[PDB]
Amino acid sequence: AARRRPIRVLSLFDGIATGYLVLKELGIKVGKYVASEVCEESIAVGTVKHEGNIKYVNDVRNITKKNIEEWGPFDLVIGGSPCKGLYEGTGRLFFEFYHLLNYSRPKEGDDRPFFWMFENVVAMKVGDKRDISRFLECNPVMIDAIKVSAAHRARYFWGNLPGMNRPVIASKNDKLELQDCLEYNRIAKLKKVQTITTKSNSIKQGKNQLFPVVMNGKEDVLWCTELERIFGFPVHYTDVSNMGRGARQKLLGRSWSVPVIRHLFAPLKDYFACE
Amino acid sequence: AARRRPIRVLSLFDGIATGYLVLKELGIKVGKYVASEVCEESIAVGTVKHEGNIKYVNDVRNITKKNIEEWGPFDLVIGGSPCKGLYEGTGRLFFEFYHLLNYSRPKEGDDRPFFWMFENVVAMKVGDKRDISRFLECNPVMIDAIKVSAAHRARYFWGNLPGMNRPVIASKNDKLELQDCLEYNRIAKLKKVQTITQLFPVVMNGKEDVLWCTELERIFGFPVHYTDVSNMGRGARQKLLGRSWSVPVIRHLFAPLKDYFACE
Amino acid sequence: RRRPIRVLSLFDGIATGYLVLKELGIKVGKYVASEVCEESIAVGTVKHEGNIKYVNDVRNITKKNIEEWGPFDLVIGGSPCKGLYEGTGRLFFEFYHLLNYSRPKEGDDRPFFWMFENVVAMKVGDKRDISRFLECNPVMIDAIKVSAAHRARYFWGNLPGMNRPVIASKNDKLELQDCLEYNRIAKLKKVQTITTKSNSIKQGQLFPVVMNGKEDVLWCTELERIFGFPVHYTDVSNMGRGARQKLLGRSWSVPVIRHLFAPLKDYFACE
Amino acid sequence: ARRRPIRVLSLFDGIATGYLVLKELGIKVGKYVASEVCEESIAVGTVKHEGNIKYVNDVRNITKKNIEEWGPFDLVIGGSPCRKGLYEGTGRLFFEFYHLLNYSRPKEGDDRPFFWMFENVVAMKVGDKRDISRFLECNPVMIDAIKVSAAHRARYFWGNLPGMNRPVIASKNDKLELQDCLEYNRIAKLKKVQTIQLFPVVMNGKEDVLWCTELERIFGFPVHYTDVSNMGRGARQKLLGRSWSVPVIRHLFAPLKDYFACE
Ligand SMILES: Nc1ncnc2c1ncn2[C@@H]1O[C@H](CSCC[C@H](N)C(=O)O)[C@@H](O)[C@H]1O
Ligand SMILES: Nc1ncnc2c1ncn2[C@@H]1O[C@H](CSCC[C@H](N)C(=O)O)[C@@H](O)[C@H]1O
Ligand SMILES: Nc1ncnc2c1ncn2[C@@H]1O[C@H](CSCC[C@H](N)C(=O)O)[C@@H](O)[C@H]1O
Numbered sequence A: 001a002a003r004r005r006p007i008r009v010l011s012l013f014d015g016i017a018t019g020y021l022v023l024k025e026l027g028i029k030v031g032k033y034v035a036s037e038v039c040e041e042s043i044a045v046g047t048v049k050h051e052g053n054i055k056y057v058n059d060v061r062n063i064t065k066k067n068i069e070e071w072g073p074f075d076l077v078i079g080g081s082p083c084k085g086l087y088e089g090t091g092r093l094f095f096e097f098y099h100l101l102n103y104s105r106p107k108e109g110d111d112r113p114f115f116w117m118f119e120n121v122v123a124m125k126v127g128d129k130r131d132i133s134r135f136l137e138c139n140p141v142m143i144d145a146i147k148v149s150a151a152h153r154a155r156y157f158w159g160n161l162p163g164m165n166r167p168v169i170a171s172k173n174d175k176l177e178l179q180d181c182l183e184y185n186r187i188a189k190l191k192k193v194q195t196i197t198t199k200s201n202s203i204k205q206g207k208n209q210l211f212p213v214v215m216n217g218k219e220d221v222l223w224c225t226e227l228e229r230i231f232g233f234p235v236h237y238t239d240v241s242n243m244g245r246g247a248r249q250k251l252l253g254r255s256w257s258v259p260v261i262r263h264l265f266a267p268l269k270d271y272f273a274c275e
Numbered sequence B: 001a002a003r004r005r006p007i008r009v010l011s012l013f014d015g016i017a018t019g020y021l022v023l024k025e026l027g028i029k030v031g032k033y034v035a036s037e038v039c040e041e042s043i044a045v046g047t048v049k050h051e052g053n054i055k056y057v058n059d060v061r062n063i064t065k066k067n068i069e070e071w072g073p074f075d076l077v078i079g080g081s082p083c084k085g086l087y088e089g090t091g092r093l094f095f096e097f098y099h100l101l102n103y104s105r106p107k108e109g110d111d112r113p114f115f116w117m118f119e120n121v122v123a124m125k126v127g128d129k130r131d132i133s134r135f136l137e138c139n140p141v142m143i144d145a146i147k148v149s150a151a152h153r154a155r156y157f158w159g160n161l162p163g164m165n166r167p168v169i170a171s172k173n174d175k176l177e178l179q180d181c182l183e184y185n186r187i188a189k190l191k192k193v194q195t196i197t198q199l200f201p202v203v204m205n206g207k208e209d210v211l212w213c214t215e216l217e218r219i220f221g222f223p224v225h226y227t228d229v230s231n232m233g234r235g236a237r238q239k240l241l242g243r244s245w246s247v248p249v250i251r252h253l254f255a256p257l258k259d260y261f262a263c264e
Numbered sequence C: 001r002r003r004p005i006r007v008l009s010l011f012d013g014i015a016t017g018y019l020v021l022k023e024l025g026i027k028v029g030k031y032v033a034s035e036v037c038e039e040s041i042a043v044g045t046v047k048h049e050g051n052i053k054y055v056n057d058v059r060n061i062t063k064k065n066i067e068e069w070g071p072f073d074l075v076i077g078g079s080p081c082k083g084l085y086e087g088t089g090r091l092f093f094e095f096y097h098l099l100n101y102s103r104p105k106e107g108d109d110r111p112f113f114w115m116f117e118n119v120v121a122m123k124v125g126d127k128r129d130i131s132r133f134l135e136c137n138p139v140m141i142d143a144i145k146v147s148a149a150h151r152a153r154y155f156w157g158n159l160p161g162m163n164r165p166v167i168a169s170k171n172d173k174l175e176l177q178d179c180l181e182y183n184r185i186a187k188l189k190k191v192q193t194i195t196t197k198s199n200s201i202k203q204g205q206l207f208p209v210v211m212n213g214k215e216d217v218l219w220c221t222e223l224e225r226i227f228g229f230p231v232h233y234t235d236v237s238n239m240g241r242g243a244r245q246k247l248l249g250r251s252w253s254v255p256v257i258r259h260l261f262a263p264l265k266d267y268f269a270c271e
Numbered sequence D: 001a002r003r004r005p006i007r008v009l010s011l012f013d014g015i016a017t018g019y020l021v022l023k024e025l026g027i028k029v030g031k032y033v034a035s036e037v038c039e040e041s042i043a044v045g046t047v048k049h050e051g052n053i054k055y056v057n058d059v060r061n062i063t064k065k066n067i068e069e070w071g072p073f074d075l076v077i078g079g080s081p082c083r084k085g086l087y088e089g090t091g092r093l094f095f096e097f098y099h100l101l102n103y104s105r106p107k108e109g110d111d112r113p114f115f116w117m118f119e120n121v122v123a124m125k126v127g128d129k130r131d132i133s134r135f136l137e138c139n140p141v142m143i144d145a146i147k148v149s150a151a152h153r154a155r156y157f158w159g160n161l162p163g164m165n166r167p168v169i170a171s172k173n174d175k176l177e178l179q180d181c182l183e184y185n186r187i188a189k190l191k192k193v194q195t196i197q198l199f200p201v202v203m204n205g206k207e208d209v210l211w212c213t214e215l216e217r218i219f220g221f222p223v224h225y226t227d228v229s230n231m232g233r234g235a236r237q238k239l240l241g242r243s244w245s246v247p248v249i250r251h252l253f254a255p256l257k258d259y260f261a262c263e
């Protein structure tokens, strides 16, 4: 942290503040974090677990250039689309990411560094993936969390962060297999779970809808605290505002894999203040 | 400057080649004119009436960046949307124009002149009009042909052409009212025809009658018998002219390009 | 001391006669047409700015009318292309009677010219019969000598130098590639005879024109050139391919009618 | 004063009513050319007139070279064959009469007298009556034989003969009523026969049709004028049914005496 400043981030579709969490877990000094989220449950998680440092705004469709020019400047712009295709409904929110990203980019004649990233699910009509790549002038890299977690989570990542397209290597602290994410006296029938959506149908193996955990000879679904270890979140990250299996699995099912995002944000320690 | 060159233009959704027609009438040298059009009847009009000077390609969807670097460079990129909204069906062809326009833009910092234009009708959702303004980073200038032609054709013009908000004035040769565009022994009830896509406008021999194809051509400012090509009857001639630009509106927009490219 | 020509054209069609007299420079003082096609009437009414006095079905033209509209210096007619004494063929007799009513009274030296066209494809007895009525033998004139299309037609009449052999002019477009628009190659040099039905374009059934490697039928503006009509002569009253090919298929070859009317500059005013 | 015999071409001559009327009229006939194809009809005028009538053939085979050879002619006459109408079938044989008539007319400006006549039935389409008048440049005069014979025979007569509209008067020798035409012991129920369902004649209180000799007196022909070439009841009535009425023609031809030689 020499002659550099704290980072100034604009996270759209921020969810449960995965981005702010990683910048802190890396030790990057976070000067400003602007989140555009509508889920009042998701908003509760970042407001509490990060002690109101995140400046929450509102629906991304009501953000204007005048706002981007005032809240800014931004060093980082990140967005993860909501998991009808592109030009219909929720998918066409990407264009709201497109415009705010362009409004945030440095003006002609400002060589200052500017990084961005946009995640989207791998399950996507190839006409759409080809289209986003045309808008962003950039081709995605597929990063599967299986290499760094105990879950299949294939996602496409556009952007320009240093060493994105670098291949993924695990760390010694990553709970690599399901038995490492489980609580006491729980035996994982498998090693890697299938992809996890918001619905409970994603917790049982695809072929016969079989439970992945066996406690006391009887099969059981995963607990909420065990989902948090699978996605790399801190334990009890989502124990907020009286949420049950319903919400907790919704907020996590939509989320990023934290060890994946840390793989992308790790080189940002080079360009901004750290402590 | 003074050492100018002929103009290199890519025209998407070209139709009946109003852009090339307005250019040669303006007196500007055209070195290349690349057109993207899929209507064989429309293709035939610009192919015949301009002696193959127009390079046709195909469906704009099949144009890649390699094509733009082969056929380029370009000084002018012009496009007119096909009149469900923007994000569905034929409205979303605009994004194809959006990418090919950005592909064709000069290299960053290249001081060469480069101008573009995009047209769309006013009968458009305000949500789509704003979104196009957000994509192009530009606000439309509305120009109605009523001031220069005998037609109601209000349209939005996105672009960076010199002086687009310039006031629209008529020429000495602009056929302003309907009676100036009619064939022999025909009298016009009206003086400015409403839009073309329930009283008849023309009375001949005391019997009401619709306009003729040759009369539609004079209304939009096209040369007479401009659409008499490829056995097209009243049907095709009307839909081609119905979807087409008004010539004096375009000549108004393209006029200041003479001070940037060659002439004669 | 000559005066403008006064002509009565029966079965007038698209006013080929008026168009040719004009292109010759003969001053026309009165042109009385008998035509029923509302499309054809529109073509001569517009292209000649209403100088042609249209009347109607020839069967309602009476002697009292010929004496009112007259005198006539030229009386021309082309038959509708079942034989003579049946159907539309026997309209020739309506031409026969109006011609004789238009003739100068016994004791009038004034010049009087007439003409009657009919198709070569005709019963051998019907050709003898018309020639018996008109006291005149026909001369076969084929547009193929002056145009790019076979058009064999018989011409009864008494115009100066009809039976003269046909020779081409410097501006006649004799081969098909002279009548085509841009980027079109003619597989042929001379088209077979053209009729109203669309099958006249396919050569007994090859398309005559090739564009972009794909063969195509003739366009309308190319038919106008093949017959010698001015281009866009039939682009009138929202007519599509249906009417244009119908009117031109029945039409006269303009370079042929010019051949016959050219010596009439000697007998009437010209400017 | 210095007149000559009459040179006549009769088309569709039938049983030669023209040559009969001319000699009965007292007019000197120098040449009579007839176009007829019925061999029985041909036989009547050949025998009843001792070959003075020059028969040629079907009118359709008569060319202008013939009309110049056999001519000149002073009289051209023709009766139409009596329905498809004019422009179909036997109606259009009129046009063959048309051209041969105009072939025979004098050179344009020649003052010599030339007379023609065309006959057709009143049972005619008005459109064909109008067309024939347009061709001939002439309007027909209707003459019914009822005024001079004992029959209904109304026919149109196109032509240029002197006084064709002249009022029809009967002569002292015209057999006017049916009883005057009948053989012995036969009584006529009627006074005038309709054109050629009760019987007209009653012989010995029994009904009976007319005899061939009685038909010959009805049309004004000489008695036994058709007793030629083994002709039975059928043929004689056919020829007489299609014939002219002799007194009607004599009416038309009477004024020719003041133009040609009479003896
Ligand atoms: N119209 C809108 N404006 C702003 N945010 C929206 C939105 N519609 C959906 N969102 C939010 O976008 C988020 C996308 S899910 C992904 C969020 C992030 N990757 C995470 O780790 O949680 C959801 O939480 C949803 O609430
Ligand atoms: N998918 C596609 N690719 C290329 N061109 C298309 C297209 N779909 C429609 N078009 C063409 O785009 C035109 C839009 S109408 C506008 C034509 C033009 N403004 C003029 O002055 O004539 C239509 O003629 C249509 O044929
Ligand atoms: N009964 C009638 N009275 C008047 N004209 C008629 C008619 N019947 C047919 N016609 C016309 O006669 C024409 C014969 S076609 C010949 C027209 C002329 N030769 C030309 O160059 O166009 C047709 O146009 C037809 O409309």
Ligand SMILES: Nc1ncnc2c1ncn2[C@@H]1O[C@H](CSCC[C@H](N)C(=O)O)[C@@H](O)[C@H]1O
Pocket: D011, D012, D013, D014, D015, D016, D017, D035, D036, D037, D038, D041, D057, D058, D059, D060, D079, D080, D081, D082, D093, D242, D243, D244, D245
């Ligand atoms: N093709 C033809 N050429 C010459 N004569 C013909 C003919 N066809 C029919 N005819 C004749 O025309 C005649 C019509 S009957 C009229 C004959 C006359 N009126 C009389 O007094 O007898 C018939 O005798 C018939 O034989």
